[PDB]
Amino acid sequence: GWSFEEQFKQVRQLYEINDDPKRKEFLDDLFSFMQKRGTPINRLPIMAKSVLDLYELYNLVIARGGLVDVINKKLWQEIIKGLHLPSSITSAALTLRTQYMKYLYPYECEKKNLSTPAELQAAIDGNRREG
DNA sequence: CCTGTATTGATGTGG
DNA sequence: CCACATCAATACAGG
């Protein structure tokens, strides 16, 4: 179920997306950095039957100054559309928020420290239905 | 032919 | 009305 080759085709799909050297350092560093976090990506989140650009998602997330700002202000529409995702996924923002929390929360919080888990968790409760 | 894991999409709530 | 959240079906691989 977890084979390095299976992941190779998955990340290879991430580098083929385009010839952006800066993007390579991200994917390369992210898989490396995640090793330190202890949360390695055995499967990249997929969107529209395609791998999610962990790099473009990041730049948009940092562009708002912290994942929490996006939740409280809901700037996911800009992220969701910024990536040109198909309206076929109604849980796009949630897919982006849920997954960003697990995989990119360290790179965004550890390298930039834009916010804290309580702010993010509190923002999550603020958007999650009370019941 | 079956079973397990990961990912995508429908409908409803609140201002 | 839209964006978001919860729950369920499908595709691929081993035998």
| Domain boundaries along the sequence of chain A | 1-131
Residue with the two structure tokens 């995702």: A85
Q: Which of left, alpha, beta for A41 (phi over 0: left; psi -120 to 50: alpha)?
A: beta
Positions of chain C reached by protein Cβ under 7 A: 3-7
Q: Is the dihedral of CA A41, A45, A50, A52 positive or negative?
A: negative
d(CA A28, CA A34): 10
Fold of A1-131: DNA polymerase; domain 1 (1.10.150)
Q: Tabulate helix, strand, coil % of chain A (nearest 5).
A: 65, 0, 35
Whether CB of A88 is under 7 Å from strand B: the answer is yes
Residue with the two structure tokens 């650009």: A53
d(CA A60, CA A80): 10
Measure A42 CA to C12 C1' (Å): 16
Instruction: List, in order, residues 6 or more apart from A101 with CB less than 8 Å away.
Output: A67, A120, A124
Task: Provide the token pair at A115.
Answer: 């916010």
Q: Give per-residue burial for A20-48: e unless 16+ CB within 10 Å, then b.
A: eeebeebbeebbebbeeeeeebeebbebe
CB count in 10 Å sphere of residue A115: 20
Measure A5 CA to C13 C1' (Å): 14
Give the method used: NMR
Judge contact between A71 and A123, C-beta under 8 A.
yes
In degrees and rounded to multiples of 5, residue A46 shows phi and psi of -105, 150
